[PDB]
Amino acid sequence: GASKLRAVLEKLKLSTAAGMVKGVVDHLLLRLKCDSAFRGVGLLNSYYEHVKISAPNEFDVMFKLEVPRIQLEEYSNTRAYYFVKFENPLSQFEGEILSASKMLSKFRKIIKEEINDDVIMKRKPAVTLLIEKISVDITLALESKSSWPASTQEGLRIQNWLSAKVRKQLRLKPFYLVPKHFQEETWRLSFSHIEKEILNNHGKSKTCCENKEEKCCRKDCLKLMKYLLEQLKERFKDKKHLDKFSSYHVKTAFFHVCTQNPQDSQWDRKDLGLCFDNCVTYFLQCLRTEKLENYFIPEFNLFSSNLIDKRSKEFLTKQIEYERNNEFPVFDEF
């Protein structure tokens, strides 16, 4: 049944837009540099990213800003949410803690004025613009070149996959803090950039996927997992069952399967059927066990009972098991 997967992958591979977003981002960055508080702003990464396989018109860029000397306070033992504490341009923003809401209020404000020179902002992903066909969600992230927080100490378990040498190099790179609530003055750790590095450099062999003898199927199974969820999230668009599931969950599940099957020979493209089945099976195992460790913060359980109700897990579990037992009808359904 694998050739239907390649058929689905063939269609995804094919599905002037990027020119318009590049221009708007260029204008937004330049005027954001005008402000004292957002002076060192630029693109983090390459001004494009499609979190949605199925939505080529839905872009997502991230604006980064370095915070030279911060001290983080772990909010209430969540391991992933922190207060940002510290001649500094950001003291315009509530006590000792840097206010996410105030910093987002000014960020939204400057962009709302900038697009008036038809780009439209949606109602209060800090900002999402509609350029009337293209959506672009802009996120503000704080950059810190200091060493990673202690909660990331046992994460990124890639030593047996991409090597301990690589893991030590990745951890020397900066981490990022993004605003999200609860105590609405918290920032959440973000390692978006590392995952992009890992995916585009995914093999144990440095020449993985650079010749016919070493063609893997890691990227293909990830795309098919994200597509599988995206279709299911849309089939139940109207209802609310799958609103708390994201592509971050399928991507986190994928990296764990990469840790579990580190050799390239376990990802031979001739066996796309079984590997993709194996990844569907792991993601289902996490749904039932209600355990899905954040790949970088192992004590942060993405599938906790306090974040996602077992009702929704049991629902998503039955949808996926029906698809897998029936050659995935949802792939050609829309």
Ligand X SMILES: O=C(O)[C@H]1O[C@@H](Oc2cc3oc(-c4ccccc4)cc(=O)c3c(O)c2O)[C@H](O)[C@@H](O)[C@@H]1O
Discontinuities after residues in the chain (C–N over 2.5 A): 15, 45, 86, 93, 117, 124, 131, 181
Q: Which is nearer to ligand X, 79 or 98 (CB)?
A: 79
Alpha-carbon gap, residue 291 to 284, rounded angstroms: 10
Contact call for residue 170 and a second copy (CB under 8 A): no
Q: Does 302 bind ligand X (CB under 6 A)?
A: yes
Signed CA dihedral, 262, 265, 266, 270: sign only = positive
Residue 260 makes contact with a second copy by CB under 8 A: no
Binding mask 207-226 for a second copy (x = CB under 8 A): x--x----------------
Give the SS3 label for residue 245.
coil
The one segment of 26-34, 215-223, 244-252, 283-291 that binds ligand X by CB under 6 A: 244-252
Tell whether 76 is in a known binding site: no
Q: How far is the CB of 300 from ligand X (least distance, A)?
A: 7
Q: Which is nearer to ligand X, 96 or 309 (CB)?
A: 309
Q: Whole-angstrom Cα distance, residue 267 to residue 254?
A: 12
Length of the chain: 334
- Among positions 128, 144, 186, 190, the unique one binding ligand X when judged by CB under 6 A: 190
Tokens of 249: 């969950």
**Binding at 181: pick from Zn ion, a second copy, ligand X, none (beta carbon under 5-8 Å per type):** none
Q: Does 60 belong to an annotated binding site?
A: yes
User: N- to C-terminal Cα distance for the chain?
Assistant: 20
Q: List all residues 6 or more positions away from 259 whose beta carbon is below 8 Å from its beta carbon.
A: 157, 158, 160, 161
Using CB under 6 A, which of 9, 38, 53, 60 touches ligand X?
60
Please report, in range form, the residues annotated as the binding site for Mg(2+). 58, 60, 137
Please report, in range form, the residues annotated as the binding site for ATP. 46, 58-60, 192-195, 226, 247-251
